[PDB]
Structures are given as structure tokens and as C-alpha cells.
Design a protein around this ligand. Structure first.
Ligand SMILES: Nc1ncnc2c1ncn2[C@@H]1O[C@H](COP(=O)(O)OP(=O)(O)NP(=O)(O)O)[C@@H](O)[C@H]1O
Length: 605
DNA sequence: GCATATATATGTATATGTATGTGTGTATATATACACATATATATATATAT
DNA sequence: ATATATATATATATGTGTATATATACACACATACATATACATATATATGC
């Protein structure tokens, strides 16, 4: 039975038991992130990046609260699983703050050990800093095995040292003359689904310092002792080199191209709100409210707001926001009221609209892609037909009238158009269907399905019958198959084995016994008062000797014959039943194929 | 303040394994686009008319 | 105020000519190349080592 008891925890146990509430994701996961202007797939833990960004945003907010005179250099050094963030701010105060429990705890140690403490619990409408909750650097202290905070206000140095996952904590005061904050912490890896800080975390932190230096050029961010220059122009051309830019006193927006989905990046003050907010929705609404009637008058096309928006990458920057509200601790969605953001943001949407209208490299690709979609929609027009003949029929394909239904209908394969003009009278109208072919027949051994349906004639054979290249022959329009390749040696040794090797792609036609070859004489000789027939030349080469005086006729083809002998060979045929044996595959490989040393040893016998 | 050492990054040069030949004609068939004129035909454009 | 009578230049088409082209199998046993990558040497340099 499920136990039902109530545990009332402290702040520390509620944080450590419910970690995913307070650091975001505590699991290694994949995302698609803009790194250095590139939409690259990353795989990382957002919790440790969030822990770095808490101290980073604390140092930046120390920058804003002194109006960028202090905390104007921020050193974020990440090496050997150790983050050292040092700024030259005025200092976390040494003055006496009081707990509600009655314990008298000094300033930086109450800021850095217990949560729900900080200097952002005052008025919200004048607070322009990215911090609200008062739990952040204490959350950095909680998920770190080692955490030292060295604070100088100019008169004293307060060292707050915590260890064993803040279970050991001690504050100490030295007389000194430094003025700034140094947070040096080594993260805990027992709760996170990682063990070390890899290069993707340092790349995310360096790209964040680059974006913050773009937003705040006065604060000199350094990573591992290397300076970072932030300009909106080079950052905007890192995304797309044709991005239209527009900078304001608080906003800075760049519009580019998104060919493989939708891309975005937005910053409210110093916060990376990667999941959005009301601000990007209001800015795209104000942009599309000018652009959509403009593209309607320009190119007369009905393209929606989302279809315009999804091809754009928008890199917009919001500075000095007031009363910022966020739906989570990680602050990834600005859920301030739309009147507040609409009053604060003074972005000129019509200038961006005319600037992307006058550009031919962003809007005109949306126009040509949309008319490509509409032309592909217009080209797909089909209807029905009254008793379609042999499904996809052919110009030279005569058809049996009971073909396709339940019957024993036979399809005819010849190579001559002269050898079918006699057929339509001498055949049955219901069971006999004739079709010639152009020239000889492709060597089709071991080669791809696409390269065999590139032939008009081979997909045409597939279109007459029920033959599909990748599956079995079950429902066939002509039940039987009767092939008449030409009677000469080129007509039996080049087109006929290539044809039956093509029919070897479905090795059940031979098994059903329906493969019939119709014999055709190549020598017809008048001897006595009668005509003797010879299917092969070697039949005559055996039987030339023991015959009397005669008048020969070599038979070039069935078109060289007359309608009477045509009627004889159709209405009384000779059906060679070609049966596939066991090892047909190696025999076809040694005949129809690239290697011919097999043909070398095979001719030699 | 200076030895130094080795590490890895990029020339580089070769040696792999393929990939495309086309060879060079024989052989098999098929397709193409024009000029020469009357004879229908057809199909749809205009008039009108109440 | 549009239905229809009707007229007229569109579409083969005949045969004669006069000329093009094109997909394939054949096979060596190389020919030229297509990249190509790849492993390894060495340079410098810089940051450690002293
Ligand atoms: N590295 C730092 N630089 C400047 N101020 C800091 C730093 N670390 C802590 N603080 C301050 O110490 C107090 C502790 O609050 P903290 O726990 O960091 O929450 P926060 O800043 O409100 N962030 P959050 O809880 O996520 O909204 C705040 O007044 C911070 O501004």
C-alpha cells in the first residue's frame, strides 16, 4: 500500500530533494543553440550552465546597480571544473542583516548560505536588474562541493567558505583594502548527470559573455584571461551576413534567414530567455502588421504571419526593462504584461518592414518559395477515365479485351513494328495482347531500382502489368507472358538473355510456368513443293547435307514473313517453358555483369 | 632571467582505392526538324432583334 | 442582351526531299585522375621548469 505521511522540510532539504524545480534540467540533454552565430546542435546540462549564469548575472547586476562605474570588468575563468568570477563592484555589504529566526548573521554569509535573501526584495517598478528571487547564489552554493566568496567593501575582506555541499559553512573577516567580489566554486557532480565541465559548457559561457558584451559594451567581460569585444554588427553578421539591423536606446534587433526551421535569440537586460516571452510576440506582431499589407500590395500573395516569421531569424536585445516577471527560476519566458513591454519597447517596426521589403535576399526568397509551393499544388491535377486500357497504356501497345480480369491473357514481346501489323487479325481479341519494343534491351544485373525505372521501356513494362520492382507478382493484367525475340543470333544472344535476366528480378514467373518463349524460324526453304522451317541457324548447319535441291530463304525477322506463316506461328505456337534453376544468380553474374574473365574461361570450353 | 622540451598541428607527399571511363568500333533499332498547297473543318466571334 | 446563323483561317496530311541525332554491350588492363586522407615529422613556443 502507498504510504501517506507528511514531511515538512527546511529550505535546504526542499531544494536538495526537488533539485529540478530550482536549477531547471538536472539531466544531460540535446538542444539546438546559437553558438557564435551558428545554429548548432548541442548536448549539455542546463543546470550547471544555470549555476554559472547565476554568478555571471549577479556580477552584471552589480554592474547595473552602480550604473556601470563598478563591476565594469568581469573575469569568468572556467578551468579544471572550477569557476572563478571576479568583478570590481562596490561589495556585498558588511552591515548587519537579521534572520526571522533571531540569529544574527552577517551580510555576505547570509547572502551566500541561506536562500530567500538578497537586495532585490524592494520596489519592482524601478528595479532594472535581472535578479528577483534572492535564492540564486545560495543555489550555486548548494550544488557546489567547494565555494569561497571573497568580498571587499574597501575596509574589510569577508571570506565565506562552504564545503561538503554547504554542510560546512564559515564566515571570517580580515582587515584589507580590496573592493570587489570573487566567487570561486567547484561544482558538485553527484546530483547532476555529468562528471566534468566539457568544452561545450565553456563555449556556451563564452558565447554568453560575447552576447553580454554586445548588449553591454561598457562592461569588459573576460574569459580565461582573454578579452571579449562585443559589437552588434559583427555579432549580427555572424548569424546571417545579410541581416538587417536596427539599434535603439534599449532595443537592438537583427533580421536574417532561417531555411531549416525557425530560429530565435533574445535577451531581456542580461537574461537569456531562450523559450521566449511576450516581447518577441509583440515585436513580430508589430512587424507583421506593417509587412503583411505591404507584401499584399507588392506581390499580391496571401502569405500568413507564421509563414513570413518562420523564415526569419530574429536576434533582438532588450535593455533596462522594468518589472520583469518570469514563469520559472531559470527565467526563460518573460511573462510581464503586454502593456508594460509595449510601453517600454520603443522599436520602430515599420522601418524594419521597409528595410526587409527593399532587400531582395530575404523577402523575395519567401515569395519564390511560396509560388513554388503554389505551382506544385497547381500541377497536381487528375481525374478519372472511362474503362482505362492496361492501366498506364502505350501508343504501340495493342490490348487484349479480357486483359486484367480473371483470365489467362498473354502479353507479347517483340522488337519490330513490322511484326505486329499482321497480328491484329490473326490473334484472338480477348486473350492476346501485342506490344513491340524499341531496339535491344538493357543489361539490368545487380543495378538499382531507380536506374532501371529511368528507362521509359522498363517502367513501361512495369506499367502494363502488375510488376512492381520491390515486391511479389500477385495480380497481373496479362496472366501469361509469351516472348518473341528475333530469330537471328543477335536476336537470341543479346536481347533474349538480357530480357530473361531482367525477368529474374522476380523469380516466381518462371516458377509459375507462365514464361513462354515462342519459337521463330530463321531459315525457311522451299524443297519439293513444301517449306521446311529451321528455328536456329545451327539446325540448318546440322541439316544442310541430307536434303535435295531447294530454294532457300533466310528469315531476318517476323516482319520478313507473310501473314499466313504469321497466323500459323501465332495460332499454333511452340512454347519453350523457361524454368529458373537453383543457382541462376551466379550464372547471370558470370554472363551479364562487369567481370568477363568468367566469360574468358567459359568461352574456352 | 633564462634553458628546454615536448606536443600537437599542419604541411606533405605518397600510396589507396576507387571512379570514370572511352577506348574503338561493331551491332541493334529508333527518333528529330524544316520547304513545297489545296481541301476541308471548326469553332467561335460578331450582329440583331424582339 | 444574349442565342444562334454563319463564315473563315486555324490543323493534318498526303509524298518528296534533306539533313540531323541517340541508348545500349561488348572488356580489358590500363589511363588519367579524383580526391583524399592520413600518418608522421618537426617547429615554435610558450609556458612550464628552475
Ligand atoms: N557574485 C556576486 N556579485 C554581485 N552580487 C552578488 C554576487 N553573489 C551574490 N550577490 C548578491 O547577494 C544576494 C544574494 O541573492 P542571490 O541568492 O544571488 O539571488 P538573486 O541575485 O536575486 N538571483 P535569483 O534568486 O535567481 O533571482 C543578492 O543581493 C545578490 O545580488
Amino acid at each position: 500500500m502507498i504510504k501517506n505521511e507528511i514531511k515538512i522540510l527546511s529550505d535546504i532539504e526542499h531544494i536538495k530533494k526537488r533539485s529540478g524545480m530550482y536549477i531547471g534540467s538536472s539531466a544531460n540533454e540535446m538542444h539546438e543553440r546559437f553558438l557564435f552565430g551558428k545554429w548548432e546542435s548541442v548536448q549539455y546540462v542546463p543546470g550547471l550552465v544555470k549555476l554559472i549564469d547565476e554568478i555571471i548575472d549577479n556580477s552584471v547586476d552589480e554592474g547595473i546597480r552602480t550604473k556601470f562605474k563598478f563591476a565594469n570588468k568581469i573575469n569568468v575563468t572556467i578551468k579544471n571544473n572550477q569557476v572563478t568570477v571576479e568583478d570590481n563592484g562596490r561589495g556585498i555589504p558588511q552591515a548587519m542583516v537579521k534572520t526571522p529566526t533571531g540569529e544574527e548573521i552577517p551580510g555576505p554569509v547570509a547572502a551566500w548560505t541561506i536562500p530567500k535573501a538578497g537586495g532585490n526584495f524592494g520596489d519592482d517598478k524601478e528595479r532594472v536588474t535581472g535578479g528577483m528571487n534572492g535564492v540564486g547564489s545560495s543555489l550555486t552554493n548548494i550544488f557546489s562541493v567547494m565555494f569561497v566568496g571573497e568580498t571587499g567593501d574597501g575596509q574589510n575582506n569577508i571570506v565565506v567558505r562552504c564545503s561538503n555541499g554547504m554542510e560546512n559553512k564559515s564566515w571570517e573577516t580580515i582587515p584589507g583594502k580590496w573592493k570587489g567580489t570573487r566567487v570561486t566554486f567547484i561544482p558538485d557532480f553527484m546530483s547532476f548527470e555529468t562528471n566534468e565541465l566539457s568544452q561545450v559548457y565553456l563555449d556556451i559561457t563564452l558565447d554568453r559573455l560575447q552576447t553580454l558584451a554586445v548588449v553591454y559594451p561598457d562592461i569588459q567581460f573576460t574569459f580565461n584571461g582573454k578579452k571579449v569585444q562585443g559589437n552588434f554588427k559583427k555579432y549580427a553578421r555572424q548569424y546571417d551576413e545579410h541581416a538587417i539591423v536596427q539599434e535603439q536606446e534599449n532595443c537592438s534587433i537583427a533580421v536574417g534567414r532561417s531555411p531549416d526551421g525557425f530560429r530565435q535569440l533574445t535577451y531581456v537586460n542580461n537574461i537569456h530567455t531562450k523559450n521566449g516571452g511576450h516581447h518577441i510576440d509583440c515585436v513580430m506582431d508589430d512587424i507583421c502588421e506593417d509587412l503583411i499589407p505591404q507584401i499584399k500590395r507588392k506581390f499580391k500573395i496571401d502569405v500568413t504571419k507564421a509563414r513570413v516569421k518562420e523564415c526569419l531569424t530574429i536576434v533582438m536585445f532588450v535593455r533596462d526593462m522594468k518589472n520583469m516577471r518570469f514563469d520559472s527560476q531559470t527565467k526563460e519566458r518573460l511573462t510581464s504584461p503586454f502593456g508594460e513591454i509595449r510601453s517600454h519597447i520603443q522599436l520602430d517596426a515599420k522601418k524594419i518592414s521597409r528595410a526587409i521589403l527593399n532587400n531582395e535576399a530575404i523577402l523575395m526568397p519567401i515569395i519564390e518559395a511560396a509560388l513554388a509551393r503554389k505551382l506544385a499544388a497547381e500541377k497536381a491535377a487528375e481525374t478519372k477515365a472511362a474503362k482505362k486500357a492496361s492501366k498506364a497504356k502505350v501508343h504501340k501497345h495493342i490490348k487484349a479485351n479480357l486483359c486484367g480480369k480473371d483470365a489467362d491473357t498473354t502479353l507479347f514481346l517483340t522488337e519490330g513494328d513490322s511484326a505486329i501489323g499482321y497480328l491484329i487479325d490473326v490473334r484472338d481479341k480477348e486473350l492476346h495482347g501485342g506490344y513491340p519494343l524499341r531496339g535491344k534491351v538493357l543489361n539490368s544485373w545487380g543495378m538499382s531500382y531507380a536506374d532501371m525505372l529511368k528507362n521509359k521501356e522498363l517502367f513501361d513494362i512495369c506499367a502494363i502489368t502488375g510488376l512492381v520492382l520491390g515486391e511479389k507478382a500477385e495480380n497481373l493484367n496479362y496472366h501469361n507472358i509469351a516472348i518473341m525475340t528475333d530469330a537471328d543470333h543477335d536476336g537470341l544472344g543479346s536481347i533474349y538473355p538480357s530480357l530473361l535476366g531482367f525477368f529474374s528480378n522476380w523469380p516466381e514467373l518462371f516458377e509459375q510456368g507462365r514464361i513462354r518463349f515462342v519459337k521463330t524460324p530463321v531459315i525457311i526453304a522451299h524443297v519439293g513443293k513444301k517449306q521446311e522451317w529451321f528455328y536456329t541457324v545451327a539446325e540448318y548447319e546440322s541439316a544442310k547435307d541430307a536434303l535435295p535441291k531447294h530454294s532457300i530463304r533466310y528469315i531476318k525477322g517476323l516482319g520478313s514473313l507473310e501473314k499466313s506463316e504469321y497466323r500459323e506461328m501465332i495460332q499454333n505456337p511452340v512454347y519453350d517453358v523457361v524454368k529458373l534453376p537453383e543457382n541462376w544468380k551466379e550464372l547471370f553474374e558470370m554472363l551479364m555483369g562487369d567481370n568477363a574473365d568468367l566469360r574468358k574461361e567459359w568461352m574456352s570450353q
